[PDB]
């Protein structure tokens, strides 16, 4: 599923992401936008370390989900990476919360640091009623 901007902002808000561990909604939108263009079936193989990125937040298989083919990987979200490719983003949100529960917070994603950190992200939620 490829969400439309405001459609996703409201969906995230209903799943309890607004201010989760101090992270505003505009920040999660900027992250999703830059990670997959709001596409839940987005995937990326990293030939370098044999891991893969899954879903709207492009969560990696080395630490967060299990795909059975990543060397010595773990499954902190206790989910099959398949769960991160569904149109329904409930599981991806629960895992994204799990990610930010670690020391780095939203900084876990490099794209966030590159395109969202210290930037004007207000434009991502404007007009969405959130
Ligand atoms: Na894994």
Curated annotation (Swiss-Prot):
Family annotation (PROSITE patterns): GLYCOSYL_HYDROL_F22_1, GLYCOSYL_HYDROL_F22_2
Pfam family membership, one: Lys
GO cellular component: azurophil granule lumen; extracellular exosome; extracellular region; extracellular space; specific granule lumen; tertiary granule lumen
Coiled coil: none
Catalysis performed (reactions): Hydrolysis of (1->4)-beta-linkages between N-acetylmuramic acid and N-acetyl-D-glucosamine residues in a peptidoglycan and between N-acetyl-D-glucosamine residues in chitodextrins
Domain C-type lysozyme: 1-130
Superkingdom assignment: Eukaryota
InterPro entries per record: Glyco_hydro_22, Glyco_hydro_22_CS, Glyco_hydro_22_lys, Lysozyme-like_dom_sf
Molecular function via GO: identical protein binding; lysozyme activity
Localization terms from the record: Secreted
Family in the record: Belongs to the glycosyl hydrolase 22 family.
Protein name as catalogued: Lysozyme C
Organism: Homo sapiens
Gene for this chain: LYZ
């Amino acid at each position: 599923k490829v969400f439309e901007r405001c459609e996703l902002a409201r969906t995230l808000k209903r799943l309890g992401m607004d201010g989760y561990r101090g992270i505003s909604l505009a920040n999660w939108m900027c992250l999703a936008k830059w990670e997959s263009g709001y596409n839940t079936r987005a995937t990326n193989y990293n030939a370098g370390d044999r891991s893969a990125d899954y879903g709207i937040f492009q969560i990696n298989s080395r630490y967060w989900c299990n795909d059975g083919k990543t060397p010595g990987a773990v499954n902190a979200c206790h989910l099959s990476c398949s769960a991160l490719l569904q149109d329904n983003i409930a599981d991806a949100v629960a895992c994204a919360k799990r990610v930010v529960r670690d020391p780095q917070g939203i900084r876990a994603w490099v794209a966030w640091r590159n395109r969202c950190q210290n930037r004007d992200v207000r434009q991502y939620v404007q007009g969405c009623g959130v």
